[PDB]
Design an enzyme around this catalytic site. Structure first.
Site, PDB file in Angstrom:
ATOM      1  N   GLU A 184       9.363 -12.300  23.950  1.00  0.00           N
ATOM      2  CA  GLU A 184       9.799 -13.797  23.289  1.00  0.00           C
ATOM      3  C   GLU A 184       8.142 -14.589  23.264  1.00  0.00           C
ATOM      4  OE1 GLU A 184      10.812 -15.935  27.121  1.00  0.00           O
ATOM      5  OE2 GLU A 184      10.163 -14.508  28.209  1.00  0.00           O
ATOM      6  N   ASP A 216      -1.132  -4.007   5.834  1.00  0.00           N
ATOM      7  CA  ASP A 216      -2.099  -4.504   5.996  1.00  0.00           C
ATOM      8  C   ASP A 216      -1.621  -4.672   7.806  1.00  0.00           C
ATOM      9  OD1 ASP A 216      -3.945  -4.188   4.175  1.00  0.00           O
ATOM     10  OD2 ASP A 216      -4.341  -6.523   3.728  1.00  0.00           O
ATOM     11  N   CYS A 269      19.002   1.633  13.166  1.00  0.00           N
ATOM     12  CA  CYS A 269      18.857   0.492  11.549  1.00  0.00           C
ATOM     13  C   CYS A 269      20.849  -0.209  11.358  1.00  0.00           C
ATOM     14  CB  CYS A 269      19.093   1.247  10.286  1.00  0.00           C
ATOM     15  SG  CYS A 269      20.066   2.693  10.128  1.00  0.00           S
ATOM     16  N   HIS A 319       0.978  -1.436  -0.050  1.00  0.00           N
ATOM     17  CA  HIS A 319      -0.089   0.111  -0.203  1.00  0.00           C
ATOM     18  C   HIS A 319       0.560   1.600  -0.215  1.00  0.00           C
ATOM     19  CE1 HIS A 319      -3.121  -2.890   0.447  1.00  0.00           C
ATOM     20  NE2 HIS A 319      -2.767  -2.866   1.924  1.00  0.00           N
TER      21      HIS A 319
END
Lengths: 344, 325
Positions: free
Chosen positions: A103, A62, A129, A24
């Site tokens: 976990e 979604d 990152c 999307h």
């Protein structure tokens, strides 16, 4: 004159690589329309998303897609790219910022989905990152030693919730300038997934080699970017400045251990954070912008999946040829900076 | 080949200061027990957990891990400047980003050469972290590593107690939530080092992992034990393991039934299996290093002792490693 290996990885290769683009599209135009009343109240007149940050669109899943689902999709694609079955995987590391539960590990969920053997070692690595590179390095040390034949490194990022909740907070009639600024960078994030199969070079003689590289840190800056499942707060100014300072330090080490000089590298696959971050990085080190592919513009910042997604996209585009020297690098929250090399 | 040059330079644990007894918890749960027609004292009589510890309010995982790390550094008699790798292995985490490791590292003041990141793997992560560090030490990438783990459960208790005593909660949900009331707070840290730097320090040989990720708390038991057996068979082949030749088993701290099942299945002398969940509950991946540190602190460990570190973790995973003291 006999020289050492500088502890770079030997006989570690990239057998397969894949990325998943989320379905999307959310445009910055739509976002701005939604934010316009708040922009007006704060007197913001420039397009801080499309024009300053340089992000015109990003992709979302979604609501009911989990990190592990996206990671699994990428993994199956990477296995196909490596033309091997899951039964050959002896290590699977998940490196995403997004996480199913506290976990068990997201790696265990992905491994379960894929049907790994009972010999498969699995765990998550979290390092903002830069974690995909950390996972590559961890896998590399086992492959080099000969402990395993193949490893999967996987990474699925879901930014749906942070978009949903941030857009709600940033459109409050009560939202302050300070909180608006604090949360703005969240609206530059994107969903996506990547996976890589790594292998002992003996098994894949013509595959790209991974040499590893160097890391430097500035952990006194660990407060610059803080994120949970539904909120990310960022000091963009200091993130940029302190990031570049740290990268300069790392590049010095890269020159020493990797022998790097910028004119001799063929591609720079860098952290995908924003146009200004990229511009500053390229300008600081005198890099040829033609060698620096970006996807931020239409996908935003995909966290630790950004780097492998860019590499996979370079591969699919036919940009990479045998012998190309590829710099993988990033600045990630920490602060940390890692620089590593791939020889295609 | 096992690791030949990886040692344990220092080790510490932190016990959390506040006691919450299971009797105290039970008084709060009594009306709900009655409603469901339970009658059994699951925490005290079944699980064998009579108390657990909690931190002061607003102690974060990073804070607890930092306290442990400082103590481990003193135990190793080295300055923070010597640390080239810091791995955080806790289930509890301050944020999704950045790593809890970077926050602990900023607290300690590590150098700009110091590599940091988190490893997450349920209650097995500390052993995973040790193994990751060992590989870097062995390759000569670093001289010293910190592996740290701070666990917080304060929020768990508040939230869970309220939730499980609310109307319409089923016996199923209630029992699942009882499990959460076995969790305890605590922290540990270990300094690992290249052996030539620390002669006479215990040596870390490495280990083996097996997984059963298809299984992804009564089942955790049997399947875990089956997985453990598979892992032990593998261990016999890489480590030369025989049950009777091991001097200590330092294991995951879950409950009495888990512990008794493990001991029985392997025919282990229970005297060789220290447990702390009676007073501390289940401290997740910190449990193993806390127990190891307590054994050390108590003078139970002698030069040449062969020590099995092992855990059965959510996944399911099982990892076993050997330390020779």
């Amino acid at each position: 004159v006999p020289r050492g290996s500088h502890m770079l990885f030997q006989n570690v290769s990239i057998a397969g690589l894949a990325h998943i683009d989320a379905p999307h599209t959310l445009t910055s135009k739509e976002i701005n329309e939604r934010l316009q009343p708040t922009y007006d109240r704060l007197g913001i007149k420039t397009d801080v998303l499309g024009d300053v940050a340089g992000i015109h669109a990003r992709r979302l899943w979604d609501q009911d897609v989990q990190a592990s689902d996206a990671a699994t999709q990428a993994a199956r694609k990477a296995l196909i790219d490596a033309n091997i079955g899951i039964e050959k995987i002896g290590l699977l590391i998940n490196t995403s910022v997004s996480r199913d539960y506290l976990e068990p590990s997201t790696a265990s969920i992905v491994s379960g989905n894929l049907g790994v053997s009972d010999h498969c070692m699995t765990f998550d690595v979290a390092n903002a990152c830069l974690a995909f590179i950390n996972g590559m390095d961890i896998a590399a040390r086992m492959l080099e030693r000969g402990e395993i034949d193949y490893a999967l490194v996987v990474d699925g990022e879901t930014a749906n919730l942070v978009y949903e909740k941030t857009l709600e907070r940033m459109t409050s009639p009560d939202v302050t300038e300070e909180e608006f600024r604090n949360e703005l960078a969240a609206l530059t994030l994107g969903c996506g997934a990547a996976a890589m199969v790594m292998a002992r070079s003996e098994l894949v003689p013509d595959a790209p080699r991974y040499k590893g590289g160097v890391t430097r840190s500035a952990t006194e800056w660990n407060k610059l970017c803080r994120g949970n499942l539904d909120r990310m707060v960022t000091d963009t100014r200091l993130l940029l400045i302190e990031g570049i300072k740290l990268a300069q330090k790392t590049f010095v080490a890269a020159k020493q251990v990797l022998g790097w000089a910028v004119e001799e590298l063929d591609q720079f696959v860098i952290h995908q954070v924003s146009r200004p971050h990229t511009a500053a990085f390229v300008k600081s080190f005198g890099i040829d912008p033609a060698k620096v592919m970006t996807i931020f513009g239409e996908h935003g910042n995909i966290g630790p999946a950004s780097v492998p997604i860019v590499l996979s996209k370079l591969k699919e585009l036919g940009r990479l040829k045998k012998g190309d020297r590829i710099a993988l690098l990033g600045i990630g929250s920490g602060l940390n900076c890692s620089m590593a090399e791939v020889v295609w």
